Amino acid sequence: GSSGSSGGSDSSLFETYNVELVRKDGQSLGIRIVGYVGTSHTGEASGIYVKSVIPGSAAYHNGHIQVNDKIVAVDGVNIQGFANHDVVEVLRNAGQVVHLTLVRRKTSSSTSPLEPPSDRGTVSGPSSG
């Protein structure tokens, strides 16, 4: 056989995934967030990132959410353009089932996705080329 799934439109460089965390009987999220602004004349970033992960917490236990991650939505809450404080309240409001939305750069330690998209050449089948 041969190898494939190599290369493709640079549209979705990263991959988003949902993480359903569970909160034990009297447990917290245990996820630290950071507010970036990305000043000028610098190679910094901008957005909410996982500063750290409190041990013995839902996040830690789950083993899905860790530092070096960009949160775009919390349990469905589109925190895309939210503020540190605005994000904090969201976490507290969230219940047991917390579906965290993170997006990391593809082609990393992580393992291939489940149903990744394909860059089709708007071709009408073998009718051509």
Side-chain angles (χ1 to χ4, degrees), residues 46-113:
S46 72
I48 300 307
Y49 297 81
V50 176
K51 181 74 159 150
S52 278
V53 181
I54 287 83
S57 86
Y60 182 83
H61 296 310
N62 210 42
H64 286 211
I65 301 150
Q66 312 90 357
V67 296
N68 318 331
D69 273 293
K70 208 205 80 206
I71 303 90
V72 286
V74 177
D75 71 77
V77 177
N78 196 246
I79 65 150
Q80 280 188 333
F82 275 41
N84 292 98
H85 44 261
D86 206 335
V87 179
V88 177
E89 65 179 88
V90 174
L91 305 166
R92 302 182 150 275
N93 274 294
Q96 201 155 53
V97 176
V98 179
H99 277 121
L100 211 315
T101 313
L102 316 85
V103 52
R104 61 210 289 158
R105 198 158 81 156
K106 296 157 154 184
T107 323
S108 204
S109 62
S110 277
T111 182
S112 303

Side-chain angles (χ1 to χ4, degrees), residues 2-82:
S2 58
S3 286
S5 69
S6 78
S9 291
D10 59 330
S11 209
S12 309
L13 285 301
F14 320 80
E15 55 151 78
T16 300
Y17 57 96
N18 273 249
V19 200
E20 180 210 332
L21 304 173
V22 67
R23 299 210 297 156
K24 270 276 268 92
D25 296 312
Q27 183 163 246
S28 72
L29 210 61
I31 299 169
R32 299 289 197 186
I33 59 151
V34 77
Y36 265 90
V37 177
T39 193
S40 207
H41 208 98
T42 52
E44 300 289 305
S46 72
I48 300 307
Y49 297 81
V50 176
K51 181 74 159 150
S52 278
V53 181
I54 287 83
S57 86
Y60 182 83
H61 296 310
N62 210 42
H64 286 211
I65 301 150
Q66 312 90 357
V67 296
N68 318 331
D69 273 293
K70 208 205 80 206
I71 303 90
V72 286
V74 177
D75 71 77
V77 177
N78 196 246
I79 65 150
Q80 280 188 333
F82 275 41

